[PDB]
Amino acid sequence: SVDLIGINVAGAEFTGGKLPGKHGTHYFFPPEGYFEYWSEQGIHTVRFPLKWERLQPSLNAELDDVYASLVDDMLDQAKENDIKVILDVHNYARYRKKVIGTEDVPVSAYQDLMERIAKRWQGHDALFAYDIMNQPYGSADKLWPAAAQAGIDGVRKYDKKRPLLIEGASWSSAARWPRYADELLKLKDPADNMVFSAHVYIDEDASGSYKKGPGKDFEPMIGVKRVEPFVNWLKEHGKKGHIGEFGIPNDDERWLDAMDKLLAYLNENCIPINYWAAGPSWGNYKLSIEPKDGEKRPQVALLKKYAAKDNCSDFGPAKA
């Protein structure tokens, strides 16, 4: 099923400079009982960041036993709690800081990673989709379309059915999406099951850092206005879409109003969202919606309201 409302569950990609790092010290997978809470809240789709260097510390090599087994366990817990999982290679189109498509990181090495991910997990019922790369940006933008094709070809060697979530250049910006997405139109999927996934934050610079408050002339429609270029591109080209990241602070009604207006527009166009972020080890991080004693999470009420209004059977927007 295609749920319009989902959440990022972040933690396995934390402390990216510590490689391999130690589970429970530098990075964190869901503990036992984690998925039960979100399932009870009516949230059944999760986007799950993974760090490429931890899954595959040598290019072209077998996946790391320890880290890949933690993914096995998390997928098992998801299935036990009726959670659908989008695996996210959360790597900015880079491996050990080098862009996919340079001599350091050939596209064939990225294809190898995606083959191994699909080979290991295509048989797992909790796996819903592959978000093949988080936020290409900067020096990776030009080479990203060719890298995306290699990642698509990699998954399709072993999984010929599941959707592939294809992000865009410039941090997968929804607001700037049509400026760069021309070369994504040339991507070819033999299974014809690609879904484009953009990101949107509503601080001034759209980084999602929220260094300041809303500001005097804050526009409540800012979220809608920043996803319109993306949704209109989908309609113009007959494509399907998705929003892989959006989040807001908990400390101003203006943020919540903009979130409500955004969710209404996504609902009208059958565009799913993955809120950023839940996760087992966020502490007092400003964008965390994980429960924490004494910290309010008004964003969750909005996600629940729109989960009850989900009447879509597929990724939109519908061609009508």
Numbering used by the authors: 1 to 320
Study authors write:
RBcel1, an endoglucanase of the GH5_5 subfamily isolated from an uncultured bacterium, has aroused interest because of its ability to polymerize cellooligosaccharides in vitro under near-physiological conditions. After the glycosylation step, the donor sugar is covalently bound to the enzyme within its negatively numbered subsites. Transglycosylation occurs when a sugar hydroxyl group is used as an acceptor instead of a water molecule during the deglycosylation step. Solving the structures of two RBcel1 variants, RBcel1_E135Q and RBcel1_Y201F, in complex with ligands has brought to light some of the molecular factors behind transglycosylation.
